[PDB]
Amino acid sequence: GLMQFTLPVRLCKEIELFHFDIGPFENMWPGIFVYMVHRSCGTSCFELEKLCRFIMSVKKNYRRVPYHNWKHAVTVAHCMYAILQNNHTLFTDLERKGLLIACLCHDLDHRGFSNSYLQKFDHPLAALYSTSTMEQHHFSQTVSILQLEGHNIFSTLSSSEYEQVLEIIRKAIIATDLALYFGNRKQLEEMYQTGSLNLNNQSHRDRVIGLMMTACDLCSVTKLWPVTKLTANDIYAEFWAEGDEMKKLGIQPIPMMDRDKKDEVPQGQLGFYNAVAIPCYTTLTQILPPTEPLLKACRDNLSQWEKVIRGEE
Numbered sequence: 001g002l003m004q005f006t007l008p009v010r011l012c013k014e015i016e017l018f019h020f021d022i023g024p025f026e027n028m029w030p031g032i033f034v035y036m037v038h039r040s041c042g043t044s045c046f047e048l049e050k051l052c053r054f055i056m057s058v059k060k061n062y063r064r065v066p067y068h069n070w071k072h073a074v075t076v077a078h079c080m081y082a083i084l085q086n087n088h089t090l091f092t093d094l095e096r097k098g099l100l101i102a103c104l105c106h107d108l109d110h111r112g113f114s115n116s117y118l119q120k121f122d123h124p125l126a127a128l129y130s131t132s133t134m135e136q137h138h139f140s141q142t143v144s145i146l147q148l149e150g151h152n153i154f155s156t157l158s159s160s161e162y163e164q165v166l167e168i169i170r171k172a173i174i175a176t177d178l179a180l181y182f183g184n185r186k187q188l189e190e191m192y193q194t195g196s197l198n199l200n201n202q203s204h205r206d207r208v209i210g211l212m213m214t215a216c217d218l219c220s221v222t223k224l225w226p227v228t229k230l231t232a233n234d235i236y237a238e239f240w241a242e243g244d245e246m247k248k249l250g251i252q253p254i255p256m257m258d259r260d261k262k263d264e265v266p267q268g269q270l271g272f273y274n275a276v277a278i279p280c281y282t283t284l285t286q287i288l289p290p291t292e293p294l295l296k297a298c299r300d301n302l303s304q305w306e307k308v309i310r311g312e313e
């Protein structure tokens with residue numbers, strides 16, 4: 001009840017910054033998450049015993065794949081923590097509660113394969129969920145873990161508060177399907193520019209939380225250059241394993257997944273920064289000005305990838 005979580009001084013100061021890296025000590029990541037819930041939500045948001053049992057069941061349902069692993073989950077939750085702390089007064093109590101949980105859970109039981117590969121392999125999940133295949137699965141695993149005994153961290157919510165939070169989590173997790181992001185950002189672009197954007201409009205909130213989810217999910221491109229660069233290796237380790245599997249099904253993978261195109265990686269990063277990341281943090285900075293450090297960090301990593309192409313590293 002009178003029990004704070006406290007971090008060492010360097011972590012206590014740097015965790016508040018968007019570019020924070022959670023570090024290589026896996027055993028500290030639960031405490032980092034709890035620290036973030038307590039400061040973002042309060043020490044009274046969740047029964048600590050239920051929260052710790054929930055964090056450990058979530059951790060246990062992430063697989064040991066190179067990128068879509070427990071470290072990604074906690075990293076995406078830390079970006080979300082940084083957005084919520086820099087926009088204190090824009091978000092309900094339920095949203096604060098829901099969005100950190102959504103981020104921790106958003107890739108539950110990922111196998112390191114795209115929706116596209118599941119559909120080509122004809123995986124049972126691709127017959128159960130025609131679109132956003134992995135993302136409906138991730139929300140489904142979230143509800144399972146929540147329904148385990150001693151795991152209902154939302155036990156103290158009213159019936160209707162409970163349903164609102166699960167609905168915030170569902171839409172947040174669906175929104176992490178990057179196929180949906182392009183249309184969502186386009187609409188947000190238009191609404192902000194015509195000045196129709198209205199945060200009391202619930203369907204507008206939804207779009208804005210959706211874009212926050214994309215921003216947190218892509219936050220590897222907003223870290224210090226050495227973190228960004230080494231995460232790219234984990235990212236391609238997954239994509240190229242998928243490319244191998246595509247070739248096994250008798251299909252030429254897209255170039256992004258073909259390890260035979262290792263050489264073109266620097267140029268694949270530019271496309272990705274120009275086509276996805278920059279537009280994402282731009283529209284986010286317009287809508288939520290204190291998130292500008294994500295845009296600035298993304299542009300610095302783009303300029304680092306341009307240096308790589310010019311042979312300056």
Ligand SMILES: Cn1nc(N2CCCC2)nc1CCc1nc2ccc(C(F)(F)F)cn2n1
Nearest residue numbers: 218219220221255256261264265268269272
């Ligand atoms: C479109 N494209 N084409 C290639 N190629 C390589 C040579 C041939 C083409 N690479 C790509 C981009 C893939 C990518 N990079 C990143 C970095 C960070 C992140 C995340 F953490 F933000 F999510 C996601 N991705 N996704």
Ligand SMILES: [Mg+2]
Nearest residue numbers: 106107134176
């Ligand atoms: Mg995902």
Ligand SMILES: [Zn+2]
Nearest residue numbers: 106107176217
């Ligand atoms: Zn993710």
